[PDB]
């Protein structure tokens, strides 16, 4: 989180969504749920925050 | 002093399941290191003399 | 993770049996909960589920519009309302659930089944 | 729609076993799984599990239960069995709704 200026990308792109606090939990990869599966899915790899 | 402003855990867990995927599943590491015959050995393979 | 069948009884075709399933060891608001019956016709049948929130509600073609699942969870106990019963619904109806819940949606509380009561004959 | 066999299996004490589960179609879900269980009833008793996802054991299960399979073609093996044994092996699906059982192997112990 602290070196995300010194980093250099191709570009960066912004996903906004309305969720359910304790869904939040699911906004992450290696993640199942009803959100994880069938609303918004993240690989499995690195990202940005 | 936490939870003040800033302050953070260096520390983190794995929640390891066993319904998850392989990349997410604990895995028992065992690193070999030799020592090499510097001092007289201690430890040699099945060989006769 | 037990459940406990009652109501089994010999009704005359055409008319209604309510069957009952007591659960405990377990939250039963937590769970899906199963109807499956068994005889020699079919083996093991599948008939029914009612989701934890009691929502959704998923019945097979073969009972689909003639049986009824629900639950009560201020008494830990699921039911059945079988309508119009028929000489070929004489089977066994045993009470499922699962233990793990770790995905309580569709369809994975199809996927375990882990958990099954004594069974209860209706004929 | 699942098909086992043998129907009836003769197997003599402390001898190895297998039950065998035929599909209709393959039992592979969307997430790329397959729901395939195993179960046992003993006569007297409702159904109990032994194995799932087509080879895990279940806590509680002996160690003698193990299986295999994939696509539509699954295996149920004991390597020994015991007198405690006796009852009707099923395999169970729930990769495509409605869940099914397969007709049930009865396993006896000569």
């Known amino acids: 989180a602290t070196k995300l200026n010194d980093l250099c990308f191709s570009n960066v792109y912004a996903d906004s969504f309305v969720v359910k606090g304790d869904d939040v939990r699911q906004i992450a990869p290696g993640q199942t749920g009803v959100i994880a599966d069938y609303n918004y899915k993240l690989p499995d790899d690195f990202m940005g925050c | 002093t936490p939870p003040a402003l800033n302050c953070y855990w260096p520390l983190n867990d794995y929640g390891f399941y066993t319904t998850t995927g392989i990349g997410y599943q604990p895995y028992r590491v065992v690193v070999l290191s030799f020592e090499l015959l510097n001092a007289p050995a201690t430890v040699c393979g099945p060989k006769l003399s | 993770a037990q459940l406990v069948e009652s109501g089994g009884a010999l009704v005359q075709p055409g008319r209604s049996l309510r069957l009952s399933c007591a659960a405990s060891?377990?939250?039963?608001?937590?769970?899906?909960m199963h109807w499956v019956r068994q005889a020699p016709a079919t083996g093991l049948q599948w008939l029914a589920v009612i989701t934890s929130d009691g929502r959704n509600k998923f019945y097979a073609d073969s009972v689909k519009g003639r049986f009824t699942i629900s639950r009560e969870d201020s008494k830990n106990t699921l039911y059945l309302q079988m309508d119009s019963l028929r000489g070929e619904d004489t089977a066994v109806y045993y009470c499922?659930?699962?233990?793990?819940?770790?995905?309580?949606?569709?369809?994975?509380?199809?996927?375990?089944?882990?958990?099954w009561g004594q069974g209860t004959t209706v004929a | 729609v699942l098909t086992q066999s043998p129907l009836s299996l003769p197997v003599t004490l402390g001898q190895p076993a297998s039950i065998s589960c035929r599909s209709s179609?393959?039992?592979?879900?969307?997430?790329?799984?397959?729901?395939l269980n195993w179960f046992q009833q003993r006569p007297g008793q409702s159904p109990r599990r032994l194995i799932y996802q087509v080879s895990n054991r279940d806590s509680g299960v002996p160690d003698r239960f193990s299986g295999s399979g994939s696509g539509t073609d699954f295996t149920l093996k004991i390597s020994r069995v015991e007198a405690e044994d006796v009852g009707v092996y099923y395999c169970?699906?729930?990769?495509?709704?409605?869940?099914?059982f397969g007709q049930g192997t009865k396993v006896e112990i000569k």
């Open positions: 060891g377990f939250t039963f608001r937590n769970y899906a």
């Open positions: 179609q393959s039992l592979v879900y969307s997430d790329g799984d397959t729901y």
């Open positions: 499922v659930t699962q233990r793990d819940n770790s995905r309580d949606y569709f369809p994975h509380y199809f996927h375990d089944m882990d958990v």
């Open positions: 169970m699906q729930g990769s495509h709704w409605p869940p099914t």
